[PDB]
Structure 1
């Protein structure tokens, strides 16, 4: 399938134990996609002071369309030193590894895979 229905645990930035996916744009996108498939991917909602507490490169989920079965359609865009790799809509949040942190909510998304 080109799209996959996921429910992503929404984590508080100060709970996050592994604050990024790796060390290159290509690695963080690769690792994000693997964790999304393996159900080991969390979402941090972006507000003032969140991104500086996470590790670059960042992986964002961004709205790709204006929401089948409650699931917002999203795609991945990476960012490193203010350059983004991808073009998409509004940020729903920043992806991080999930290693058992307790979420505050779930974000239903349809991921273009």
Structure 2
């Protein structure tokens, strides 16, 4: 049974390595696909810097920090927020990065998160 939060270690990818640059073609689809790939262990994380988002495909899926005191066991608590045409779907804290499919690219680090399911 699905707990409200799940501990995940996400591979951190450099933007130029990413082969599949988004999760789909609408806000609802990208959130759905991101959640599926997170469950399947096939989701990467790109840290946002200048030039990153223009090299990825909208709609974007961000992981954002969802509280201040609780980083259990080393895993920062996060939730998903999508963006399309400058409008965001969810309100949350600071961005940890943008999620993308992972298809075997070599990461530069792993990021521990405690992900809110829905």
Which category describes the TM-score, using the shorter chain as reference length?
over 0.9
Q: Indicate the SS of the match to 2:64.
A: strand
Match of 1:6 in 2: 8
Q: Quick one: which of 33, 36, 47 aligns to 1:34? A: 36
Kindly state the Cα deviation for residue 32 of structure 1 after the two structures are TM-superposed.
Answer: 0.2
CA distance in 2, matches of 1:30, 1:112: 13
Q: Indicate the SS of the match to 1:35.
A: helix
Q: Indicate the SS of the match to 2:48.
A: coil
Structure 2: gaps spanning 5 or more residues? none
Kindly state the Cα deviation for residue 29 of structure 1 after the two structures are TM-superposed.
Answer: 0.1
Kindly state the Cα deviation for residue 41 of structure 1 after the two structures are TM-superposed.
Answer: 0.2
4+ residue runs of structure 1 moved beyond 3 angstroms?
none
Kindly state the Cα deviation for residue 59 of structure 1 after the two structures are TM-superposed.
Answer: 0.0
Q: Indicate the SS of the match to 2:35.
A: helix
**TM-score, normalised by the number of residues in structure 2:** 0.95
**TM-score, normalised by the number of residues in structure 1:** 1.00
Q: Indicate the SS of the match to 1:31.
A: helix
CA distance in 1, matches of 2:88, 2:80: 10
Post-superposition Cα deviations, 1:10-54, rounded to whole Å, max 9, x if no partner, equal 000000000000000000000000000000000000000000000
Kindly state the Cα deviation for residue 84 of structure 1 after the two structures are TM-superposed.
Answer: 0.2
The alignment of Structure 1 onto Structure 2 pairs a total of residues equal to 113
Match of 1:55 in 2: 57
Q: Indicate the SS of the match to 2:51.
A: coil
